[PDB]
Design a protein around this ligand. Structure first.
Ligand code: HEM
Ligand code: HEM
Lengths: 111, 446, 439, 55, 54, 49, 49, 54, 146, 55
């Protein structure tokens, strides 16, 4: 149950479309996870500040080496890419709480 | 089964009775085994000219040092061995002497209170030794940043008027005060018509009235052609005093405008406005989550060490404003948001925050009377300012009639486009110029 | 208005129901929790949760956890967030304060009786189910330095901290504030351990002011599991006796010379309390000369300079500290301590008069009645009683106990202080302040 | 005065030199020529530009 | 790159006289220029946002 | 000793109506600010022309 | 305050600024008319007809 | 009589959300103020005393 | 003081004399935390005028002829030391000071009253000091004789 | 005398945006058009002024 609202996508089945898009996006070739490429607004920036030191420091190096790869216009070897199944959201739990906090704060103002 | 409104109705009603010479005997019956009784008199700095300024502080000091009946420390020894607490405070409009003891101890407490009032001794050695005492904490009071600033604010807000004098008075006036001035001050301001003897606790009103009839009957009123002197209005004066002293670490600044007065009904709406702005000083667990926008910003970026909103009420004037304590590089950053909050209520106040202010005012009145000691002060002081004493239920009726429209109208009448009085102390270099302060009273600048 | 000193009220013409007083309801739950609900029909309602989670219950490893736990209020919980708690409390005008002594930790909420149910949820969630998120605890950490700085600004608040440190090697010696090295070293794991161990039915009691018993009954006993076996406290303490002297160049010298006294509830503690007023432990007349104060009068002769002295009676559940606290100039610090100490020795030698005892009994009775006279003070009195003991004692019974103190017991209490092992804590300019061996 | 003023990384701070700049109190009238010179400069440009549209 | 190509189509057809082949192509290129940025591009971001579990 | 401070005499520069210390300053507050703003309003009117 | 409704507070804030916003638009209207003596506006005024 | 305030002994600091941090039970300081030497030290990094809720 | 107190053994030794003595010898070698900035030039002049006065001095030189030392030293004072509330004549008291700072390693110093220098009893303690071992002799050794 | 603390109380502090300004390492060639645009302005003004001396 993935891909498109239809039960079957254009290029057969539904789950493989997201897998196909992950390789098409190409941020795994740089050694970055999905949440390492997110837009840093006033919400995401706070949710980064709550990251544990072991996870925040890991994110820094993944970004640091990706810019080195982008500077040289290169990519990581085929064995060092971020697998689609092994990519996990290390920032979604923190984003959701800031979503919850901001929604309560915003709605409390209008009362 | 007992709602908030019903509980206010069940509060015992104050009983006020008048004596033959004009003494107002007031009490509130209760069930406590303890009680306090005190006498509130119309006296203070505002009633003293420049020549006898600070007599009340001098008089209050000698009040407990000896009477005609109990010379020396016998008056003090009677209270201490009895187990009672004796206290006395004096401000620019009132002075008081209240004693807290057991309910069964009421008959002796009233007898002592009459002796302090009618039979002050003022021994020649007592004045000389108390003169050096009064000259002592005057040096001490120089170190109180908050009290000095409010004295500065009073000096310039009501400059050239009796209300600008200090309760303690100038040091030179203290040195030159003699016994003749003190006894003249007593015989002019300590009269029955301008007096009220209040009490609260486990005491019957009949007992207090009879006790007052036994001891306070000797008090006299309408002494001479002066009889009961009348006050004169004091004119507020928009000004600014800046004692810049860089040695002191923090800056205390108080800015206020003329208030309505004691009897003006606009005090309720103004007290709701102050509750909305609130208070905060560097020790609240709320931090950035505090409901008051001024407190939330002041805590988010650490603007002030302290700040509070006050409404000082007098017979026909007042000092409605705020006082804040901050760094030497935060005066402009908070005076800008302090006045910005004032202009918000005058222009755009929402009903939700007025409801927060109304609830805050509701708790202030109910929780202030946490015993017999604050009740008698409320009973005694009201009978000198409001005339009658306002029941708590009546206060709720006036509070429930305040809304956003009232707050917007009331605030815009005393705050918007009015000349404020500014008092500073410490490192006030950053403190903005008065024209910058004055122009902050209005928005849109056009 | 009604139950603001005795928990039994005099008849006041039953009519209307709010204008009528009633008795007091005291119950103990099967799990050990204690509920003491009151209905004084006052406009304001006050609820307090009293816990045996004082600063003494911290061991050496987790010092300062109680201080951070005291500041830990108004933080995100499992039912209400930090924003919701701060906004929800202030919207109804209520207040939320945490009182913590060395033994107890009281969670008090004050509001109007119309919205006491809202204050119930914000109290249990804060007290029982805190999330203790790592970022929030880290952000609240620098407040420890700010709170300790202002609280230690008063010079006599620091001598008391050293007084217990010098007198004990154990629980009671822990200061009420996080140590200078622990600011930043506290972790959410320690806070969860402290909460889990020290928040239990057997060490908690719920006290209300203007609330029905079933309302309090239904909101008490949910998830209390284990006692405070983490360390130090929960397994008794012991008294040491020492001397701590700190110099800071201050103009005024604060000295506290105490000894070992008896614990609360014990009949010997009452002997010290009435002895505390024989020596004089606070002025009664503003700007008075303290004629009846034996300590102040004793030092009045000889010392003709500003000074201050009063008795000190710190009593606890397991032990106590009794002695005198003095303030004097460094030029004559030793004279004031020695003169005040010699006066106590005269009391121990039987040089006491019955009228002196009678006045002290009157001061003790009056001082106690006004202490519980206030609504806030009344809650603290019963709240600690429901923790130290298992039931409430009416003030009339307390007055009888004070009146049942023989004059011989006062002399014996004085002998215990004089002959005991002293514990001296001093501060200021200690050039002339004597040591323990110099009396 | 309305808020904490928030923001600030803009060109307004460059304009603090025209609003919040400290200045001596006893500055005499011989000093308006500094601002007068700026008035004269932008006046020549204003009239000069319209003159250059027909010259 | 469809927008860039369309912008080049607009540039190519701008310099040509208004006749029947360039009237049809001119309208289609112009209507696509606004349609891409206003509709297709914002819809493109929404589709991928769903495609990346967020 | 801070009570020894007294605001000096400003009666030399004081407006005639606020000269009296007994009379309240709120009676003429509308007109004291009215006259000063009248100058500003008349200056902007001239500059607008 | 009522159970966190949807935009009641901003409606109250808007109503406070409506009387001044309506009068502020007069400056934009009259000022623009004053700038270029617009023909069909300077016909209802009695003095400037 | 089982409390920390009735005996006027040890200390009991208070931390609040709508009130100031108040610490201190009875101990000798009032009688020192009458022979005034205790200068009420400056509010260097200090909050406002006596609180504000009444 | 901050750098000199980085070594945890310095703090204990300063506290050891504070705990043991009440008089002169209990004074720490570093300015107290409250005295930083409270020292005044008049105090320094008094300290010099009282203690920097010949009979408490001694001039020692290496590789310099005696007349050079003798001639340069004939310009000195004739004063002795003063009095002191906390420093003058030392008298042993004996106490106990305990400081907690959460450090991993615990430093403890338990001492009694020995004899002064010159006295034959001081030599007895000095040889007793090496009986118990007062410092390694072999790098990374197991201290068999200690 | 601190070589890093250069003639700061001058216009060089503004020029620190041209020398010590932090910039991303992975900047591609498409960013060069920012500096090219400034050169285009200077070139157009330089040739324009000399054109205006005969037009
Ligand atoms: C500091 C700036 C300037 C100064 C001091 C200045 C000065 C002068 C002077 C003294 C004249 C002689 C006029 C006469 O004697 O009749 C003149 C003429 C002229 N200026 Fe400028 N000028 C300035 C800026 C400009 C600018 C910015 C422009 C065009 C954009 C301009 C355009 C002209 C023209 C077209 C004339 C000839 C027309 C005439 O003389 O009336 N000027 N200028
Ligand atoms: C961003 C700045 C400028 C741009 C984009 C620009 C653009 C142009 C263009 C497209 C032409 C048409 C030339 C042709 O088609 O033959 C032109 C002509 C001209 N420009 Fe500019 N110009 C700029 C600045 C200036 C300046 C600053 C001056 C004078 C100081 C100037 C003076 C002239 C003159 C005199 C001509 C006519 C001579 C000629 O066409 O060769 N221009 N300009």
């Amino acid at each position: 149950m993935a891909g498109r609202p239809a039960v079957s996508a254009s290029s057969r089945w539904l789950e493989g479309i997201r897998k196909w898009y992950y390789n098409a996006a190409g941020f795994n070739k740089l050694g970055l996870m999905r949440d390492d490429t997110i837009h840093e607004n006033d919400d995401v920036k706070e949710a980064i500040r709550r990251l544990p030191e072991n996870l925040y420091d890991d994110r820094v190096f993944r970004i640091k080496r990706a810019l080195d790869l982008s500077m040289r216009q290169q990519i990581l070897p085929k064995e060092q890419w971020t697998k689609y199944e092994e990519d996990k959201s290390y920032l979604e739990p923190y984003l959701k709480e800031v979503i919850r906090e901001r929604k309560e704060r915003e709605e409390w103002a209008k009362k | 089964t007992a709602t908030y409104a019903q509980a206010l109705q069940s509060v015992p009603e104050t009983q006020v009775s008048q004596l033959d010479n004009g003494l107002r005997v007031a009490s509130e019956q209760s069930s406590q085994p303890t009680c306090t009784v005190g006498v509130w008199i119309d006296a203070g700095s505002r009633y003293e000219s420049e020549k006898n300024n600070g007599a009340g502080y001098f008089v209050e000091h000698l009040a407990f040092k000896g009477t005609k009946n109990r010379p020396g420390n016998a008056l003090e020894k009677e209270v201490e061995s009895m187990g009672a607490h004796l206290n006395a405070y004096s401000t620019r409009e009132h002075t008081a002497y209240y004693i807290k003891a057991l309910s069964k101890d009421l008959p002796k407490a009233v007898e002592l209170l009459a002796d302090i009032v009618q039979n002050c001794s003022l021994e020649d050695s007592q004045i000389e030794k108390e003169r050096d005492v009064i000259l002592q904490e005057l040096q001490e009071n120089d170190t109180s940043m908050r009290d000095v600033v409010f004295n500065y604010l009073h000096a310039t807000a009501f400059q050239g008027t009796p209300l600008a004098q200090s309760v303690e008075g100038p040091s030179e006036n203290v040195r030159k005060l003699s016994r003749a001035d003190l006894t003249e001050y007593l015989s002019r301001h300590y009269k029955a018509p301008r007096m009220v003897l209040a009490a609260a606790g486990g005491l019957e009103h009949r007992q207090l009235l009879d006790l007052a009839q036994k001891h306070f009957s000797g008090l006299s009123g309408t002494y001479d052609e002066d009889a009961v002197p009348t006050l004169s209005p004091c004119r507020f004066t928009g000004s600014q005093i800046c004692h810049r002293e860089d040695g002191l670490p923090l800056a205390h600044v108080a800015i206020a405008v003329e208030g309505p007065g004691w009897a003006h009904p606009d005090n309720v709406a103004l007290q709701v406005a102050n509750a909305i702005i609130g208070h905060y000083d560097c020790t609240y667990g709320g931090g950035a989550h505090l409901s008051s926008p001024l407190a939330s910003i002041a805590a988010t970026n650490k603007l002030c060490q302290s700040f509070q909103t006050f409404n000082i009420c007098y017979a026909d004037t007042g000092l409605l404003g705020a006082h804040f304590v901050c760094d030497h590089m935060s005066i402009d950053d908070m005076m800008f948001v302090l006045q910005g909050q004032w202009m918000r209520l005058c222009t755009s106040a929402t009903e939700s925050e007025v409801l927060r202010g109304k609830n805050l005012l509701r708790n202030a009145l109910v929780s202030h009377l946490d015993g017999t000691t604050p009740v008698c002060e409320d009973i005694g002081r009201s009978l000198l300012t409001y005339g009658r004493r306002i029941p708590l239920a009546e206060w709720e009726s006036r509070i429930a009639e305040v809304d956003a429209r009232v707050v917007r109208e009331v605030c815009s009448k005393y705050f918007y486009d009015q000349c404020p009085a500014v008092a500073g102390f410490g490192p006030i270099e950053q403190l903005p110029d008065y024209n910058r302060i004055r122009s902050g009273m209005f928005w849109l600048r056009f | 208005s009604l139950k603001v000193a005795p928990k039994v009220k005099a008849t006041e013409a039953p009519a209307g129901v709010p204008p009528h007083p009633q008795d007091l309801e005291f119950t103990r739950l099967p799990n050990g929790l204690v509920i003491a609900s009151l209905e004084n029909y006052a406009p304001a309602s006050r609820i307090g949760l009293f816990i045996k989670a004082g600063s003494r219950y911290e061991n050496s490893n987790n010092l300062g956890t109680s201080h951070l736990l005291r500041l830990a209020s108004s933080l995100t919980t499992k039912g209400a967030s930090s924003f919701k708690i701060t906004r929800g409390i202030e919207a109804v005008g209520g207040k939320l304060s945490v009182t913590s002594t060395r033994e107890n930790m009281a969670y008090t909420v004050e509001c109007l009786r119309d919205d006491v149910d809202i204050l119930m949820e914000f109290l249990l969630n804060v007290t029982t189910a805190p999330e203790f998120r790592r970022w929030e605890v880290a952000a609240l950490q620098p407040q420890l330095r700010i709170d300790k700085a202002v609280a230690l600004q008063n010079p006599q608040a620091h001598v008391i901290e050293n007084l217990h440190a010098a007198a004990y090697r154990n629980a009671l010696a822990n200061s009420l504030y996080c140590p200078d090295y622990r600011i930043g070293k506290v972790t959410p794991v320690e806070l969860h351990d402290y909460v889990q161990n020290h928040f239990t039915s057997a060490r908690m009691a719920l006290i209300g002011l203007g609330v029905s018993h079933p309302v309090l009954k239904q909101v008490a006993e949910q998830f209390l599991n284990i006692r405070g076996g983490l360390g130090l406290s929960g397994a008794k303490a012991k008294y040491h006796g020492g001397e701590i002297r700190e110099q800071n160049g201050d103009s005024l010298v604060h000295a506290a010379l105490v000894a070992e006294s008896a614990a609360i509830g014990s009949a010997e503690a009452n002997a010290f309390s009435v002895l505390q007023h024989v020596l004089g432990a606070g002025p009664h007349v503003k700007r008075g000369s303290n004629a009846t104060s034996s300590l102040y009068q004793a030092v009045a002769k000889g010392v003709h300079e500003p000074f201050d002295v009063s008795a000190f009676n710190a009593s606890y559940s397991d032990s106590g500290l009794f002695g005198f606290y003095t303030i004097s100039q460094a030029a004559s610090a030793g004279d004031v301590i020695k003169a005040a100490y010699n006066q106590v020795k005269t009391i121990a030698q039987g040089n006491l008069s019955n009228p002196d005892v009678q006045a002290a009994k009157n001061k003790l009775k009056a001082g106690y009645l006004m202490s519980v006279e206030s609504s806030e003070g009344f809650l603290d009195e019963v709240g600690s009683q429901a923790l130290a003991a298992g039931s409430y004692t009416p003030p009339s019974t307390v007055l009888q106990q004070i009146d049942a103190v023989a004059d011989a017991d006062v002399i014996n209490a004085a002998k215990k202080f004089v002959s005991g092992r002293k514990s001296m804590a001093a501060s200021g300019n200690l050039g002339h302040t004597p040591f323990i061996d110099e009396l | 005065m309305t808020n904490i003023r928030k923001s600030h990384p803009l060109m307004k701070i460059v304009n603090n030199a025209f609003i919040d700049l400290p200045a001596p109190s006893n500055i005499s009238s011989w000093w308006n020529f500094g601002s007068l010179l700026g008035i004269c400069l932008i006046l020549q440009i204003l009239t000069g530009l319209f003159l250059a549209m027909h010259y | 790159w469809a927008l860039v190509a369309d912008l080049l189509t607009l540039t190519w057809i701008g310099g040509q006289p208004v006749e029947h082949p360039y009237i049809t192509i001119g309208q289609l290129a112009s209507v696509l220029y606004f349609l891409l940025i206003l509709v297709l591009m914002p819809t493109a971001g929404t589709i991928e946002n769903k495609l990346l579990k967020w | 000793s801070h009570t020894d401070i007294k605001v000096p005499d400003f009666s030399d520069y004081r407006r005639p109506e606020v000269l009296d210390s007994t009379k309240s300053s709120k009676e003429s507050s509308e007109a004291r600010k009215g006259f000063s703003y009248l100058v500003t309003a008349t200056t902007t009117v001239g500059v607008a022309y | 305050m009522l159970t966190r409704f949807l935009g009641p507070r901003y409606r109250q804030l808007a109503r406070n600024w409506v009387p001044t916003a309506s009068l502020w638009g007069a400056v934009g209207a009259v000022g623009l008319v004053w700038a270029t003596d617009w023909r069909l506006i300077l016909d209802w005024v009695p003095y400037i007809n | 009589m089982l409390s920390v305030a009735a005996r006027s002994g040890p200390f009991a600091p208070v931390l609040s959300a709508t009130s100031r941090g108040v610490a201190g039970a009875l101990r000798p300081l009032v009688q020192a103020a009458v022979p005034a030497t205790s200068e009420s030290p400056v509010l260097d990094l200090k909050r406002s005393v006596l609180c504000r809720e009444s």
